[PDB]
């Protein structure tokens, strides 16, 4: 073309996509913000689900969350655009200087990159917990706990990041010409290792983990565990009351159950807790856990393959300001976080659609166990506990909501 450039065109394409996706999500955010402002009256369908006092408490909470979501989101989108345009990343790469040498430079660049990321986002994080979560009486955290936890998490992150990054960069630089297969198999091992280690060693460092005390709930759970042939080791009661009044539950293994102390206490009755367990046990029995891993490793193989195909192109490096050298870590950032952006956005939308279908299947499994009436009462009680707005814009919930709306889940259980 005697009218358009090459490297400057692909850089513009990245930013043009990043802004259209942002404007799409902002249009969606505006569409749902209107729902919070318009629907001031309790609907006749969700009339028995929520009362006028709880509905208005939920209306203002989701409204304050929406306002923050915009400005915190806008700052991020502006920062990203400004760092790229100003040429922050290549200049930050230069200041982290002065195969082992490139890996060391990549390691210090990463240490500096994550340090700025953590510090710039910390005031926004501090606002959410101490202004939004505190105004609507959810937060139970002190400024000291928040600060001590932020450092705790940042330290633990770097101690996992640096050795994994150094070994991954080593495999790409040393290995070849089919380096992407060993690099994909390395991430495959690192994924399964960190999954088993996390809940047993990493997770108890930030939150107090204690096994469920013996009682009517503990005995009935073992009866249910033996019934579904679930290899239960122990049930855990996570001290989530030290952070916030929010209630939830999860499960892990290679097996142990994880339930919030806010859900057990106020919370949900023992009959409702067992129904919530029956739903979570559904993801194990229906193989939702195994299916999600198969998708994640299929995605990384496709990504590493296209990376190996595009790493050789010097045009993508020159686009973002890298002319003198083509660094490996920089190649991973440009291709995985910018070139793959359209694919990553489509895949995320497809996985959100799948997550909703996986939740309906786990709810259907809870009904198949007979605890349908108990789960119906639990879902409503947990919605009041977390001040969840029952009304939602269809276009917003279809794109963002990993869990289907309360009214949709309740109607499937009633049937």
């Amino acid at each position: 073309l005697w009218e358009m450039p090459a490297e400057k065109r692909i850089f513009g394409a990245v930013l043009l996509f990043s802004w259209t996706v942002y404007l799409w999500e902002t249009f969606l955010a505006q569409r749902q913000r209107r729902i919070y402002k318009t629907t001031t009256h309790v609907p006749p369908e969700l009339g028995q689900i929520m009362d006028s006092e709880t509905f208005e408490k939920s209306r203002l909470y989701q409204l304050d969350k929406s306002t923050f979501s915009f400005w915190s989101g806008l700052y991020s989108e502006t920062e990203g655009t400004l760092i790229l345009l100003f040429g922050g990343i290549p200049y930050l790469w230069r200041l982290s200087g002065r195969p082992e040498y490139e890996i060391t430079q990549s390691l210090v660049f990463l240490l500096l990159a994550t340090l700025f990321s953590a510090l710039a986002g910390l005031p926004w994080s501090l606002y959410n917990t101490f202004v939004i979560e505190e105004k609507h009486g959810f937060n139970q955290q002190t400024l000291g706990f928040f600060m001590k936890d932020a450092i705790k998490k940042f330290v633990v992150t770097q101690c996992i990041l640096l050795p994994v990054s150094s070994l991954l960069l080593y495999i790409i630089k040393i290995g070849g010409d089919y380096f992407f297969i060993y690099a994909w198999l390395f991430t495959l091992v690192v994924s399964l290792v960190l999954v088993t280690i996390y809940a047993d060693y990493i997770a108890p460092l930030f939150d107090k983990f204690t096994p469920l005390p013996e009682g009517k709930l503990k005995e009935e759970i073992e009866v249910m565990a033996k019934s579904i042939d679930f290899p239960l080791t122990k049930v855990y009661v996570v001290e989530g009351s030290k952070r916030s009044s929010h209630s939830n539950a999860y499960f892990y293994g290679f097996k142990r159950i994880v339930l919030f102390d806010t859900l057990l206490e106020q919370g949900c009755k023992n009959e409702e807790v067992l129904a919530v367990l029956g739903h979570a046990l559904g993801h194990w029995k229906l193989g939702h856990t195994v299916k999600n891993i198969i998708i994640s490793q299929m995605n990384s193989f496709l990504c590493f393959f296209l990376f190996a195909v595009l790493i050789g192109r010097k045009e993508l490096f020159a686009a973002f300001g890298f002319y003198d050298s083509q660094p490996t870590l920089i190649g991973l950032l440009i291709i995985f976080q910018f070139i793959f952006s359209p694919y990553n956005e489509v895949l995320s939308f497809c996985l959100t659609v799948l997550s909703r279908r996986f939740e309906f299947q786990a709810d259907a499994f809870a009904k198949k166990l007979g605890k349908a009436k108990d789960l119906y009462s639990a879902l409503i009680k947990l919605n009041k506990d977390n001040l969840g707005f029952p009304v939602s814009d269809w276009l917003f919930s279809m794109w963002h909501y990993s869990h289907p709306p309360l009214l949709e889940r309740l109607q499937a259980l009633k049937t």
């Binding site: 939830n248 539950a249 999860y250 997550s355 939740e359 947990l382 977390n386 869990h403």
Partner: peptide, 4 residues
């Protein structure tokens, strides 16, 4: 997976 989760509940909420």
């Amino acid at each position: 997976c989760s509940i909420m």
